[PDB]
Structures are given as C-alpha cells and as structure tokens.
C-alpha cells in the first residue's frame, strides 16, 4: 500500500531529488483535507450496518435472486452476500483515508472478477448494489466528503466490470 504521502516520496526518490516546490504543494493538498477524511472515516464506521441494510433491501432483496434457485438463496449465500458488501465499504474507507486507491488493487480487486465468474455471482447485480450503497453513504458525509468517498466506489465497480 502507498498513500498520498508515500506516492510523492516515491516520485522524488526515483530521481534522487529532495522534495521540491511541486512536491510540497501536493503534500499541503493532503494535509489541508486530512482532518476531513478522519471525520468522514468515523461517520461511515458508525453507520456501516445501516448503509448495507438499506442498500440491500432497496437493490436486491425481493428480487428473483433471493428466491429458490438463485444466488444468495440459502442462509450462507445470504450471509456471504452482506459479508461482501461490508468488505467493499471497509476497504473504500481505507482508500479515502490514504487518498490513493492502491490498497483496493492489492486486497480487493486481486483477481475478483474471475472468482465471481467461476462461482456464478451476478456481476451486474453486485455493481448496482455497490452503487446503491453509494447513494446512502453520500447523504451521510455530505458532498465535499462524498467526493473522495464516491471516487473509490466507482473504482471498485470500474475494476469489477
């Protein structure tokens, strides 16, 4: 994993240079918005249970998926349903804090499209469930805090399709 601070240290170190003016400007961009992410990161951790409960019921609850013969039918399949959505919500909160989506490519999108295709999980429905989870999570942290939040929800859906 590399955050916004480490990503600028990387760009400088590959040239052997100290931190110049263009580098110190990117560092102030992170520090100035830093205590806003720490406030949004605690607000989502407190509403994690309801962000998923309202996203599921609104998106895929009375759908054919929960009826006999579909995916998420058995209780284990339902429990693996809502266990996956909390994985995305918990990792998108790690990315908004670090300001760099590098943690999502190593520990979330690490070949997740092949796993969902083999098992038979509907990729079209999981992308719309994450999207439904973006409209309820955005009404909590506001627009300015939701900008960096929704930036990573679309990263998971784009890296999943």
Partner 1 sequence: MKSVITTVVSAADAAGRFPSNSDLESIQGNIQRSAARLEAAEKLAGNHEAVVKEAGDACFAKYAYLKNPGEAGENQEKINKCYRDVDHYMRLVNYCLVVGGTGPLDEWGIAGAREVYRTLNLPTSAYVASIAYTRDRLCVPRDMSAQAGVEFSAYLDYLINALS
Partner 2 sequence: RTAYPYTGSGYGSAGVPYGQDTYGYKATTAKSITETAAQAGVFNTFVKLLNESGVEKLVEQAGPYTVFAPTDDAFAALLEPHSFNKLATLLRPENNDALRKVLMHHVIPGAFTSASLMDRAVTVKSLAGEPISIMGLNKLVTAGTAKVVRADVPCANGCIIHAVSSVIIPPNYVPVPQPTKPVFPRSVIAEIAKLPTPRQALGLDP
Partner 3 sequence: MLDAFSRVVVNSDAKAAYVGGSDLQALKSFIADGNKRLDAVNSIVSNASCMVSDAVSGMICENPGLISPGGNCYTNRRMAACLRDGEIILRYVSYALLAGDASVLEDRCLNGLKETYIALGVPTNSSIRAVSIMKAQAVAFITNTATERKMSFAAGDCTSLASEVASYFDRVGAAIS
Ligand X SMILES: CCC1=C(C)/C(=C/C2=NC(=C\c3[nH]c(/C=C4\NC(=O)[C@H](C)[C@H]4CC)c(C)c3CCC(=O)O)/C(CCC(=O)O)=C2C)NC1=O
Q: Does the footprint of partner 3 cover residue 128 (CB under 8 A)?
A: yes
What is the number of alpha carbons within 13 Å of residue 81 lying toward its C-beta?
A: 24
26 binding partner (options partner 1, partner 2, partner 3, none; Cβ < 5 to 8 Å by kind): none
The 10 Å Cβ neighbour count of residue 151 is 14
Q: Does the footprint of partner 1 cover residue 161 (CB under 8 A)?
A: no
For residues 119 to 158, the per-residue mask of contacts with partner 1, x marking binding by CB under 8 A and - elsewhere, is: ----------------x--xx---x---------------
Rounded to a whole number of angstroms, the minimum distance from the CB of residue 59 to partner 3 is: 10
The 10 Å Cβ neighbour count of residue 61 is 12
Q: In whole angstroms, what is the distance from residue 84 CA to residue 90 CA?
A: 10
Q: In whole angstroms, what is the distance from residue 143 CA to residue 128 CA?
A: 21
Rounded to a whole number of angstroms, the minimum distance from the CB of residue 150 to partner 3 is: 3
Q: In whole angstroms, what is the distance from residue 96 CA to residue 82 CA?
A: 21
Task: Tell which one of 56, 85, 149, 156 touches partner 3 (CB under 8 A).
Answer: 149
- How far is CA 89 from its chain centroid? 5
Please say which residue, 32 or 118, places its beta carbon nearer to partner 2.
118
The residue ranges that bind ligand X (CB under 6 A) are 60, 65, 71-72, 76-77, 80-81, 84-85, 87, 108, 112, 115, 119, 121-122, 125-126, 129
Q: In whole angstroms, what is the distance from residue 23 CA to residue 64 CA?
A: 52
Task: Tell which one of 73, 83, 143, 147 touches partner 2 (CB under 8 A).
Answer: 73
Binding site for partner 3 (CB under 8 A): 128, 131, 134-135, 138-139, 141-151, 153
């Amino acid at each position: 994993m590399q955050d916004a601070i480490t990503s600028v240290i990387n760009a400088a170190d590959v040239q052997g240079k100290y931190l110049d003016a263009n580098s110190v400007e990117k560092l102030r961009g992170y520090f100035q918005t830093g205590e806003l992410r720490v406030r949004a990161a605690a607000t989502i951790a407190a509403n994690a249970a309801t962000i998923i409960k309202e996203a599921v019921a609104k998106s895929l609850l009375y759908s054919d998926i929960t009826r006999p013969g579909g995916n998420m039918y058995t209780t284990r399949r339902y429990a693996a349903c809502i266990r996956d959505l909390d994985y995305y919500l918990r990792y998108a909160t790690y990315g908004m804090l670090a300001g760099d989506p590098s943690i999502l490519d190593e520990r979330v999108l690490n070949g997740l499209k092949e796993t969902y295709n083999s098992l038979g999980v509907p990729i079209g429905a999981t992308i719309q469930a994450i999207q439904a989870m973006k409209e309820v999570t955005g009404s909590l942290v506001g627009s300015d805090a939701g900008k960096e939040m929704g930036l990573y929800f679309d990263y998971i859906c784009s890296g999943l399709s």
